[PDB]
Amino acid sequence: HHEGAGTIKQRTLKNIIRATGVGLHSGEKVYLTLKPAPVDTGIVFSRTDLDPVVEIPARAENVGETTMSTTLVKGDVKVDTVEHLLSAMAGLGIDNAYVELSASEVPIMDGSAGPFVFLIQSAGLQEQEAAKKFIRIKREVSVEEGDKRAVFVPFDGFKVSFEIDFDHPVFQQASVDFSSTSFVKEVSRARTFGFMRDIEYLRSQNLALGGSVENAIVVDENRVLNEDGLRYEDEFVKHKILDAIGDLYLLGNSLIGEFRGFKSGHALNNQLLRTLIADKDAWEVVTFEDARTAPISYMRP
Numbered sequence: 231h232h233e234g235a236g237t238i239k240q241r242t243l244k245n246i247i248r249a250t251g252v253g254l255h256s257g258e259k260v261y262l263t264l265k266p267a268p269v270d271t272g273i274v275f276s277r278t279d280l281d282p283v284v285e286i287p288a289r290a291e292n293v294g295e296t297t298m299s300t301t302l303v304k305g306d307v308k309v310d311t312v313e314h315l316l317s318a319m320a321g322l323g324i325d326n327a328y329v330e331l332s333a334s335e336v337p338i339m340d341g342s343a344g345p346f347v348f349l350i351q352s353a354g355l356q357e358q359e360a361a362k363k364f365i366r367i368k369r370e371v372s373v374e375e376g377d378k379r380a381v382f383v384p385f386d387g388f389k390v391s392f393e394i395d396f397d398h399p400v401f402q403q404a405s406v407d408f409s410s411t412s413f414v415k416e417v418s419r420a421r422t423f424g425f426m427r428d429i430e431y432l433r434s435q436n437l438a439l440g441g442s443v444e445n446a447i448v449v450d451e452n453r454v455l456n457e458d459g460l461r462y463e464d465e466f467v468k469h470k471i472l473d474a475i476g477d478l479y480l481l482g483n484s485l486i487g488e489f490r491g492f493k494s495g496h497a498l499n500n501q502l503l504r505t506l507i508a509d510k511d512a513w514e515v516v517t518f519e520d521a522r523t524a525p526i527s528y529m530r531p
């Protein structure tokens with residue numbers, strides 16, 4: 231036993247994770263396997279139902295549609311609704327992993343990232359022999375469209391603010407800083423949500439076909455319909471934060487910076503990432519030779 235500086239290191243899974251579920255939008259039954267991956271692989275989604283297998287790295291450049299969920303595309307092959315799983319992975323510091331899926335949509339589980347964090351954390355994480363690379367924000371980068379707004383600001387840590395503006399009796403602002411807030415405890419359990427009003431339209435378009443009170447906060451004209459209510463008083467805005475954490479992980483590396491979202495969503499989050507990547511003065515890749523002086527820290531593996 232000796233004392234010295236240690237690099238903050240890349241992580242993969244210690245064991246394989248298998249789950250079965252349903253696609254929120256497609257309603258399809260889907261089998262999910264997460265597997266360990268070598269250093270610098272990133273998170274790569276593998277459609278194992280196809281022959282040959284089609285692999286899509288979870289990066290901003292592969293993002294197709296972003297109307298309802300965050301979708302990845304390569305050719306005519308898609309992987310839908312990647313944000314909640316990706317959010318779980320970013321939240322626990324996973325750099326490298328294969329996500330195999332038997333169908334085009336990640337399973338929705340209970341509508342949050344909780345079950346994923348739980349499955350992953352039961353399997354365990356494996357630190358690997360390479361420095362973890364971070365993306366540090368060095369300038370303000372903002373995108374807007376109409377009243378929607380998404381911003382990166384320099385910040386020595388990682389924090390996220392979000393504000394939504396729904397006119398609905400059921401109601402809007404939250405900030406979370408990973409120096410104090412636990413991702414796992416205060417964010418990961420926040421479920422997706424939908425309004426009864428949109429549901430038939432959505433289904434009329436073959437969207438929300440797997441959605442139910444079992445996997446979503448469902449809201450009618452006046453109230454939450456789920457018999458047992460909300461897991462957090464501000465669950466709705468907490469889920470928007472959960473979504474943003476997963477959409478930001480399409481950078482392919484954790485962030486050192488601050489994100490602020492104002493009625494933001496998947497499209498604008500993706501626009502923001504693209505604008506950031508284009509503006510190489512506004513960011514740089516960094517490592518930390520000494521975890522003790524880093525501005526971020528992680529749970530034991």
Ligand SMILES: CC(C)(N)[C@H](NC(=O)c1ccc(C#CC#C[C@@H]2C[C@H]2CO)cc1)C(=O)NO
Pocket residue numbers: 298299300313314422423424425429432438441442443444446448469473495
């Ligand atoms: C919140 C956000 C960002 N808009 C998005 N979620 C969705 O779009 C979405 C979520 C739930 C439903 C439903 C249902 C249902 C249902 C069945 C009718 C009730 C009966 O049992 C529909 C759409 C998201 O969290 N994306 O990541």
Ligand SMILES: [Zn+2]
Pocket residue numbers: 313314422469473
């Ligand atoms: Zn979501």
